Write a protein that binds this ligand. Structure first.
Ligand SMILES: Nc1ncnc2c1ncn2[C@@H]1O[C@H](COP(=O)(O)OP(=O)(O)OP(=O)(O)O)[C@@H](O)[C@H]1O
Lengths: 626, 49, 806
């Protein structure tokens, strides 16, 4: 309420420019601006306001006639969008100045509650700024300039934002509960409404394949009113939130039925049979699949009184609840979220592993190639391979080659030959521990999990610093610091591990690389190669030895601890990171009581009932299972 | 203090780190994958003008 | 005419082609033999085009081609579709099998084109097949429009155009980026194959690529030296062919510059060809740059394992085709110099199968692989200057409807001129081919296109066709304009069209079912809005003319013309349109103010005609029944319950006010707007009096032919606005309609049909049961049990007797 003279010229310049970038944003989001006539601007009359609206200083409040200007919904959405953009501009400015979000405002620590995304912004402030912006843009719209807001373009985001390796999770009964004969019934309550499937699955059903994409599953998909055994066909109708799907299987007549809240679902024809001709095939088990942000519940009818629509449909027809005559809860198996290393199947679609015996002039080798390369539907993604047995470092660290030195040494070697025509930049060579479970489509050496434990004295001076990770590997491309064609001779990275000192070193082509690692005592290192296949032949593990270094077999096998001759016993095979595995949900969990005691005492977490499980440990893989 | 990180609309709770806990089997919520927390980090990116 | 040619044709058409026809199902999953299948298809088609073949030979070729193409995957026939795109629009005698083939292919694989995903395993179109299909459609359409009418050719052309239109996505943006430097060598006006290599004269290789040229020359020389040592050629201190000694295994450095050109020349030509197409070749600096900074033994880079992306693979395919074109032009020149002859390989690269293509493919893939391994990157130089996607002018349906509207307007002028000059000397009016093209192509094309793409035009911000669709507001406006133009064209011309009148009324039916009244009235051209308003007004005027003509009759021309026009066209069009409006709840959107008063006149005329006790309307009472039921379901004001219509926000009396109500011809009284239509209470009194008086159907049939379907449709529409459905804001409800009304009417219906089960059977019972099907569902199921008691009683006891009923 001051003329521009005494008014803070910085504030007035902020006003003028923020309006200038305001019209710039108007044109940037795609709005078309057109003046019908400068005289059209002139004809509409400016109000001169009485003393109530009139300020004190004299900067006369002059609003133009805004009564007759109404905006189309696209223009109103434009107003909302540019208000969001202004909020983003202000937040970014304050962040650059150094302000951060806090649940209350603190000027001393430069903390504001308003530094949140516009969707979370509080309604009062957001609508106040929005209506000020609306009046500002309406002024120009009534100033003879029509502002054609660009037509809104709908975008389908598929509501998928999960982990890179998981798009759905599959829950099923245990394989041992497969029903070969009889009439069986279970229920599936849909807490949400979306990407969900429910039905019956054979024991061999895979956890990373969509239900009904292959023959192993017979499922109903109520998101799109479809049925899935081998592909999809239209069937039934769509559920809503809170609906109940009753699944019936009759092995005697080899039929399947689905009911939605009691009513029997029927296909395009009048048939009530979702699936009508299938073999018994090792029985069927209840199964469901849930997508991103989907919640379900599966009731096997252990307590028949808890079934919502069994009496309405299923009871009089002779179908039994799946858990009708059981004394304990059905064990539930669900798709494992953490990938694990396992042997390459002999029937794998893409990966082939060939074991080559060592000759007099050649060391034993394990060649990794591609079955599906040079053809269609060939996956071009990074595969993580390892050897099935680890090298264990010394438990306490001390502070023609010679036979005596070779006997007394604790240094072991292997090699990886990247074949000609395979891109070295797509191949990583080195060691991993049993903790490595990071399946990423894009793997780089800078994102390996790592930490540093720094131990100091009472004063605070660091007396030791330990670097710990699960990935100690180098890239063949960077190791090949000079770039060439690589087909003159296949590239050969040599990995050397000194277990007596826990020292990991690498050799490029007879030249020692600058990259080295220091590991803790008792560390178990699995030889590992990460490769993105650009060739039918990918790489080759080589179990030979170099001067003054024992072969890998000597370190791996106690019975071969003193044998310098390289060996590849059948126990040593090539494993790869895969997601085709199931997890067993525990039948019983720890009982934890959590409660807010008071504003001063905090949050009490209490657990008093002992619970134990019996763990079976695999010595090879340094892992344990229930 | 760690309570200052609560988002303005949410309320602070102490809960299980994992999805599944001790419940009745037929009342247990089976959960699919969850969306990534995009609102967790607020990076204001304006339209370039 | 040579004996060998005739005997070979006989052998093929008698033994080989029938064998392939019988083994056609084996051609299903052969996706890994695309070159062989393309060779077979192109050879068979180029054989089908010929002059030394008999009718049986042509028939055998047609059967073989159709059988194989019906089993091949849609992606395997792209090149054949290209030949078809060039050859079909001529519409010669040789085009009939091509049209049949295209019809079958597009009918089978419409999902491969139309759906955004397409067939799951087969995939979707590559946008090049979409451009080819659109080009084929428009070429055939223009050629057929120009062509003089021929029966078989038109009967084969209409299915092809319809199938291509149905296969193309309605919202297919025409990619203004045409195929850049597309080769014309395969496609020629004269002959089948004319090799036209890409010009390389003025292209100059940049000095940046000289190092790559030298390196690839060294590689080629080293690989050659490997091959020479392999077959045993000993190093040439001096040449000696007998002892197998070659001086050229010396190193490239010791090779002379005059000699080096033998290796550098193909490399230079390949690079010039790549640059001529506009491709950019640019260095990835670090690798090749440091390759710059830092007794013959043949050792060459082994590029067998190195792979190429799909884009660079297509690059290599184009380069191999160019190599084949260069060789083919050279060999054609040599053969012409010799004066005759024909090499078996003087065929298009598409017609060549894998073994012949292997060498050129190896050359192109080799040069591209060396570019990659040295570090140089190849890519399309051209980038689309502007996307131009949101502009709906490029949309295929936009232009299709523009052309359809233009043809309809022209036909309107044509029949207007013929009506003006029918009795003149020109009994054959000049525009015979044009009017016959219209009648025999345009109307069925509209019919089938709007059968196929109904949901796309109806699609809005609402759910239907959520995957991909949502026709534009202008597109819906053109749909409405087309419907109005077809209606005004068919008005009073059933006599002129005759057999065609069925086609026009079917087109109007389906266009009306595809109309989007809400969006058109909200955002649409004032001319189109006025056209729809005038169409409804014209329907009202014609119905009123029929009503007065019925009274003026009793003596039986204009009378017969208007009566037959009504019965044939007006009742079906109005029935379908009002049914669509009622189903989509459009009445609130369009039936307001003048449209509402026109609908009031329509309703009064319909009731008068239905209730009239005339032998002339006796035959047509039923169609009036469906029309009046549809109007009752569509009309947004409770006309029967006239005592409380002040609550209706959509009523003329509550909106348009007294001054304008008096300016229009309105009674100013809601009880007097429809004097001859009884109230709901009076109608139910009549209905309860019947079925107890025991009336027969023929005694007075207008009730259960016309009035009862009206009551069922009116109940169905106005029950969800009822006060039992609105305990909230009660007595502000526009209707006093109740479920008790619903079940009372249904029970009276049952009693009527039960009294009439013995005699006067007809089919009106099934008609009326169909009308009562919607009134059944809304009845409460608990009373519906023990309400089916009469239903099961009289479905068997009086239905199953000597007399056949229902
Ligand atoms: N409603 C308003 N519209 C425009 N400018 C305003 C408004 N209210 C205050 N201002 C101006 O903005 C400045 C201070 O308000 P503003 O919200 O921009 O503060 P800030 O420093 O960005 O906020 P914070 O400390 O929360 O980060 C002053 O120059 C003031 O004149």
């Amino acid at each position: 309420l001051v003329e521009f003279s005494k008014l803070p010229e910085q504030e007035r310049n902020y006003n003028l420019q923020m309006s200038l970038e305001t019209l710039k944003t108007l044109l940037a989001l795609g709005c078309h601006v057109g003046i019908s006539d400068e005289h059209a601007e002139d004809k509409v009359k400016k109000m001169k306001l009485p003393k109530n609206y009139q300020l004190t200083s004299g900067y006369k409040p002059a609003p133009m006639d805004l009564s007759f200007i109404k905006l189309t919904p696209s223009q109103e959405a434009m107003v909302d969008k540019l208000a969001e953009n202004a909020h983003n501009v202000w937040a970014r400015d304050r962040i650059r100045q150094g302000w951060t979000y806090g649940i209350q405002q603190d000027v001393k620590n430069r903390r504001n509650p308003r530094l949140v995304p516009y969707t979370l912004l509080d309604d009062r402030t957001k609508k106040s700024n929005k209506d000020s912006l609306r009046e500002a843009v309406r002024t120009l719209l009534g100033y003879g300039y029509n502002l054609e807001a660009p037509d809104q373009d709908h975008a389908a985001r598929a509501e998928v934002c999960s982990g890179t390796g998981e798009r759905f999770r599959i829950f099923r009964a245990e394989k041992t509960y497969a029903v070969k004969a009889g009439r069986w019934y279970f229920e599936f309550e849909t807490v949400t409404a979306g990407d969900m499937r429910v039905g019956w699955s054979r024991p061999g059903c895979q956890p990373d394949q969509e239900l009904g994409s292959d023959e192993r599953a017979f499922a109903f998909d109520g998101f799109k009113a479809q049925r899935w055994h081998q592909g999809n066909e239209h069937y039934g109708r769509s559920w809503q939130a809170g609906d109940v799907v009753g699944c019936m299987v009759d092995m005697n007549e080899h039929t399947m039925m689905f009911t939605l809240n009691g009513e029997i679902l029927l296909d395009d024809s009048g048939s009530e049979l979702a699936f009508k001709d299938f073999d018994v095939g090792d029985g069927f088990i209840p199964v469901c699949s849930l997508g991103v942000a989907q919640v379900g519940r599966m009731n096997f009818g252990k307590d028949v009184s808890t079934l919502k629509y069994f009496t309405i449909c299923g009871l009089q027809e002779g179908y039994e609840p799946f858990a009708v005559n059981t004394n304990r809860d059905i064990t539930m198996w669900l798709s494992k979220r953490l990938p694990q290393f396992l042997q390459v199947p002999s029937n794998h679609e893409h990966i082939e592993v060939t074991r080559i015996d060592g000759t007099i002039d050649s060391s034993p080798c394990l060649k990794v190639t591609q079955k599906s390369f040079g053809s269609q539907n060939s996956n071009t993604d990074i595969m993580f391979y390892r050897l099935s047995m680890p090298i264990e470092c010394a438990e306490v660290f001390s502070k023609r080659d010679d036979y005596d030195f070779l006997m007394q040494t604790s240094t072991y070697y292997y090699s990886v030959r990247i074949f000609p025509g395979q891109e070295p930049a797509n191949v990583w060579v080195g060691w991993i521990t049993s903790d490595f479970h990071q399946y990423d489509t894009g793997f780089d050496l800078d994102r390996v999990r790592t930490v540093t434990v720094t131990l100091g004295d009472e004063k605070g001076k660091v007396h030791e610093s330990i670097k710990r990770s699960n990935c100690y590997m180098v890239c063949a491309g960077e190791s090949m610091s000079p770039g060439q064609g690589r087909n003159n001779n296949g590239l050969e990275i040599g990995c050397v591990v000194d277990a007596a000192s826990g020292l990991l070193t690498f050799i490029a082509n007879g030249k020692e690389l600058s990259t080295y690692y220091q590991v803790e005592p008792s560390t178990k290192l699995f030889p590992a190669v990460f490769a993105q296949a650009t060739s039918p032949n990918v790489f080759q593990f080589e179990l030979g030895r170099i001067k003054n270094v024992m072969p890998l077999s000597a370190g791996l096998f106690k019975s071969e601890h003193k044998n310098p001759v390289p060996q590849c016993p059948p126990r040593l095979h090539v494993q790869f990171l895969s997601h085709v595995l199931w997890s067993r949900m525990p039948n019983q969990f720890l009982k934890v009581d959590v409660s807010r005691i008071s504003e001063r005492q905090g949050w009490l977490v209490q657990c008093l009932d002992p619970l134990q499980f019996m763990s079976l440990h695999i010595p090879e893989e340094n892992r344990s299972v229930d | 203090p760690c309570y200052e990180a609560v988002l303005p609309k949410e309320k602070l709770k102490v809960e299980h780190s994992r999805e599944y806990k001790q419940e009745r089997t037929y009342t247990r919520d089976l959960l699919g994958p969850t969306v990534s927390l995009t609102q967790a980090a607020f990076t204001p990116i304006p339209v370039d003008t | 005419a040579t004996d060998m040619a005739l005997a070979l044709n006989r052998y093929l058409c008698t033994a080989v082609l029938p064998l392939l026809t019988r083994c056609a199902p084996l051609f299903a999953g052969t996706e890994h033999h695309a070159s062989l299948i393309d060779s077979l298809l192109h050879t068979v088609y180029r054989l089908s085009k010929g002059c030394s073949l008999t009718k049986a030979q042509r028939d055998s070729i047609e059967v073989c081609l159709l059988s194989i193409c019906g089993q091949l995957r849609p992606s395997m026939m792209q090149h054949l579709l290209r030949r078809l795109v060039f050859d079909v629009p001529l519409l010669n005698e040789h085009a009939k099998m091509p049209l049949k083939l295209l019809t079958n292919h597009y009918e089978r694989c419409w999902k491969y084109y139309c759906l955004p995903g397409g067939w799951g395993n087969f995939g979707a179109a590559s946008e090049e097949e979409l451009h080819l299909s659109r080009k084929l459609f428009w070429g055939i359409f223009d050629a057929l429009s120009q062509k003089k009418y021929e029966q078989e050719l038109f009967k084969l052309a209409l299915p092809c155009l319809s199938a291509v239109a149905g296969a193309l996505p309605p919202d297919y943006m025409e990619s203004n980026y045409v195929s850049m430097m597309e080769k014309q060598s395969s496609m020629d006006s004269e002959g089948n194959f004319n090799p036209q290599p890409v010009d390389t004269s003025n292209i100059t290789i940049p000095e940046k690529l000289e190092y790559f040229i030298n390196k690839y020359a060294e590689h080629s020389h080293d690989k050659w030296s490997m091959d020479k040592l392999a077959n045993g050629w000993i190093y040439g201190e001096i040449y000696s062919d007998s002892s197998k000694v070659q001086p050229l295994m010396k190193p490239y450095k010791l090779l002379s510059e005059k000699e080096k050109e033998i290796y550098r020349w193909p490399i230079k030509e390949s690079l010039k060809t790549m640059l001529a197409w506009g491709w950019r070749i640019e260095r990835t600096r670090e690798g090749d740059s440091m390759a710059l900074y830092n007794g013959y033994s043949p050792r060459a880079i082994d590029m067998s394992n190195v792979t190429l992306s799909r884009d660079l693979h297509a690059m290599a395919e184009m380069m191999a085709e160019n190599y084949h074109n260069i060789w083919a032009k050279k060999k054609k020149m040599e053969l012409e110099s010799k004066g005759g002859g024909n090499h078996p390989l003087l065929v298009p690269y598409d017609t060549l199968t894998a073994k012949e293509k292997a060498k050129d493919r190896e050359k192109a893939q080799d040069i591209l692989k060396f570019l990659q391994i040295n570090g140089y990157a190849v890519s399309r130089g051209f980038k689309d200057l502007e996307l131009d996607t949101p502009s709906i002018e490029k949309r295929f349906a936009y232009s299709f409807l523009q052309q359809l509207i233009r043809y309809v307007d022209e036909a309107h002028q044509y029949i207007l001129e013929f009506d003006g000059g029918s009795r003149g000397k020109g009994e054959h009016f000049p525009y015979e081919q044009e009017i016959k093209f219209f009648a025999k192509v345009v109307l069925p094309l509209i019919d089938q296109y709007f059968k196929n793409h109904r949901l796309y035009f109806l699609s809005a911000a609402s759910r239907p066709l959520c995957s991909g669709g949502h026709a534009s507001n202008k597109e819906k406006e053109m749909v409405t304009s087309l419907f109005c133009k077809l209606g005004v064209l068919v008005r009073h011309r059933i006599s002129l069209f005759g057999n065609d009148a069925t086609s026009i009324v079917n087109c109007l039916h389906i266009l009306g079912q595809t109309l989007d009244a809400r969006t058109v009235m909200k955002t649409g051209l004032e001319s189109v809005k006025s056209a729809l308003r005038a169409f409804l007004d014209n329907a009202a005027e014609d119905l009123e003319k029929t009503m007065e003509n019925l009274k003026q009759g009793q003596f039986t021309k204009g009378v017969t013309q208007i009566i037959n026009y009504t019965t044939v066209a007006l009742l079906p069009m109005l029935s379908s349109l009002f049914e669509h409006i009622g189903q989509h709840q459009f009445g609130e959107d369009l039936i307001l103010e003048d449209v509402q008063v026109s609908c009031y006149r329509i309703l009064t005329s319909l009731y008068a005609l239905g209730t009239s006790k005339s032998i002339y309307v006796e035959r047509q009472r039923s169609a009036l029944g469906e029309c009046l039921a549809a109007f009752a379901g569509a009309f947004p004001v409770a006309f029967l319950e006239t005592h409380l219509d002040k609550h209706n926000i959509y009523s003329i009396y509550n909106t348009k006010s007294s001054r304008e109500r008096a300016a229009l011809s309105l009674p100013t009284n809601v009880e007097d707007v429809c004097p001859n239509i009884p109230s709901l209470e009076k109608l139910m009194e009549e209905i309860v009096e019947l079925a107890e008086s025991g009336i027969r159907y023929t005694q007075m049939p207008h009730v259960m032919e016309v009035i009862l379907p009206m009551l069922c449709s009116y109940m169905s529409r106005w029950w969800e606005h009822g006060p039992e459905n609105n305990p909230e804001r009660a007595e502000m409800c526009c209707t006093a309609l109740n479920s008790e009304h619903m079940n009372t009417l249904l029970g009276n219906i049952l009693k009527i049909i039960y009294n009439n089960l013995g005699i006067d059977e007809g089919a009106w019972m099934k008609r009326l049961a169909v009308f009562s099907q919607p009134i059944i569902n809304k009845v409460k199921p608990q009373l519906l049990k023990t309400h089916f008691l009469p239903l099961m009683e009289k479905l068997k006891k009086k239905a199953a007797t000597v007399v056949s009923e229902e």
